[PDB]
Write an enzyme that holds these catalytic residues in place. Structure first.
Site, PDB file in Angstrom:
ATOM      1  N   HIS A 200       0.827  -1.198   0.000  1.00 27.71           N
ATOM      2  CA  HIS A 200       0.000   0.000   0.000  1.00 27.71           C
ATOM      3  C   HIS A 200       0.861   1.248   0.000  1.00 27.71           C
ATOM      4  CE1 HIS A 200      -3.734   2.152   0.709  1.00 27.71           C
ATOM      5  NE2 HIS A 200      -3.160   2.813   1.700  1.00 27.71           N
TER       6      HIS A 200
ATOM      7  N   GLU B 198      -1.057  -7.680   1.580  1.00 26.22           N
ATOM      8  CA  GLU B 198      -0.494  -6.369   1.852  1.00 26.22           C
ATOM      9  C   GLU B 198       0.957  -6.432   2.313  1.00 26.22           C
ATOM     10  OE1 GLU B 198      -2.380  -3.167   1.785  1.00 26.22           O
ATOM     11  OE2 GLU B 198      -3.475  -4.473   0.402  1.00 26.22           O
TER      12      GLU B 198
ATOM     13  N   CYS C 206       1.162   3.218   8.216  1.00 22.37           N
ATOM     14  CA  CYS C 206       1.262   1.981   7.461  1.00 22.37           C
ATOM     15  C   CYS C 206       2.713   1.580   7.194  1.00 22.37           C
ATOM     16  CB  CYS C 206       0.512   2.165   6.149  1.00 22.37           C
ATOM     17  SG  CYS C 206       0.235   0.657   5.240  1.00 22.37           S
TER      18      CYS C 206
END
Lengths: 169, 174
Positions: free
Chosen positions: A27, A51, A136
Site C-alpha cells: 500500500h 499487503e 502503514c
C-alpha cells in the site's frame, strides 16, 4: 537503535530486519517504482503476500543492523509492541494484544492479516498520539526469551484507534 | 491566526534535565536537575520567582507572562489509581517519545543514594521497556506526565526515577 531501522518508504514506512532484508506494505510502494535504495527492482528478490511486502537485496545495505527473526504472526493472546514513527519526530511504542486472523474493510479498502487490539489505543488517540493513515508499514515486534521477533507490518487501524491489522509472511 | 504550539515545545532543557511550561508563568520541574548556581532563571532573578517545593517536585511561578504562546493547562497532584497517562519524554538526541503508563498508589524508592517519592506507574509498552531500546533514563528527569479528561489536558507531575527493571516509574507531584 531499533528506531533507526524504521525508515520512510513510499507514502509510509518500512523496516530493516537484517542488513539485506526489508519489509513494508504494498500500500506504501508508489505506482511505477523502478529502484529501491538505489538498487534496480530487477536485481531485488520480491515477495508480495497480500499487503505484506518482502524485499531481499543483493548486497548487505545497512551493515550496522543486527538481523532479527521474521515470523508469520504471533500466537493468539501474545502481547507485542507496535513501533510507530511519525514524519514529525514522534517515536511511539503502543502495546498490542494479538488475536485471530481476519479480513477487514474500513473505507472500501480491504486488508487482511492478523487482528490485534491496542491496549491504550483510545488513550493515545485522545491526546492525538494514536494511529493515523500514515503509520502503514511500521513493525509489530516482541521479544521471545532472548530472541527479537518481527511478526508483520501495520496496514490498517479502525477509526477508534484500538483495532489493528498486521500483515504477515 | 497562527497554529497553537505543540505540547512538545513546552518541554525545555533545565539544568541537567527538563521542565514543563504549565502556563505562561508556571514552570514545573524536578529539584534534582535545578542548576543551583546562577541567580537568573529565564529572564527573572531567583528572588522574584515564587518557589514551592515538595520532595523532588519543583514549582516556579513567574511575575511575568513569559512563554506567551502557551495555553494554560490544569495542574493536579497525581491521578486516580488506574488512570492511564502519557509520559512525554524528550531527549537531546531530538527523539520525542510518549510512553503510556498506568498509575498506582503513592510510593517511595531509593535511587542513586537518595530517597525519592510520589505516585508510581507501570509502563505499558508491550514488551518490557528495557528489552528493546525503550524505557526511561536518568537524563529524562523532569519530563511531564499528562492525560486528557473530557476536553482538558491535566498534568499530574514530572519524572523522577525508575526501577532497575525499567518498567516501574515514579511521578513527583504537588
Amino acid at each position: 537503535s531499533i528506531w533507526s531501522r524504521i525508515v520512510n518508504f513510499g507514502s509510509g514506512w518500512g523496516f530493516w530486519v537484517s542488513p539485506s532484508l526489508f519489509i513494508t506494505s504494498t500500500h506504501v510502494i508508489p505506482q511505477g517504482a523502478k529502484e529501491f535504495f538505489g538498487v534496480p527492482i530487477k536485481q531485488i528478490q520480491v515477495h508480495k503476500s497480500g499487503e505484506f511486502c518482502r524485499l531481499r537485496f543483493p548486497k548487505p545495505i545497512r551493515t550496522d543492523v543486527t538481523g532479527m527473526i521474521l515470523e508469520e504472526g504471533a500466537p493468539e493472546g501474545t502481547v507485542v509492541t507496535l513501533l510507530i514513527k511519525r514524519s514529525t519526530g514522534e517515536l511511539m511504542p503502543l502495546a498490542a494484544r494479538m488475536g485471530t486472523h481476519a479480513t477487514m474493510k474500513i473505507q472500501g479498502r480491504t486488508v487482511g492479516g492478523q487482528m490485534g487490539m491496542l491496549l491504550t489505543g483510545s488513550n493515545a488517540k485522545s491526546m492525538d498520539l494514536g494511529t493515523t493513515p500514515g503509520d502503514c508499514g511500521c513493525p509489530y515486534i516482541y521479544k521471545r526469551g532472548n530472541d527479537y521477533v518481527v511478526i508483520g507490518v501495520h496496514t490498517a487501524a479502525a477509526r477508534g484507534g484500538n483495532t489493528v491489522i498486521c500483515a504477515t509472511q
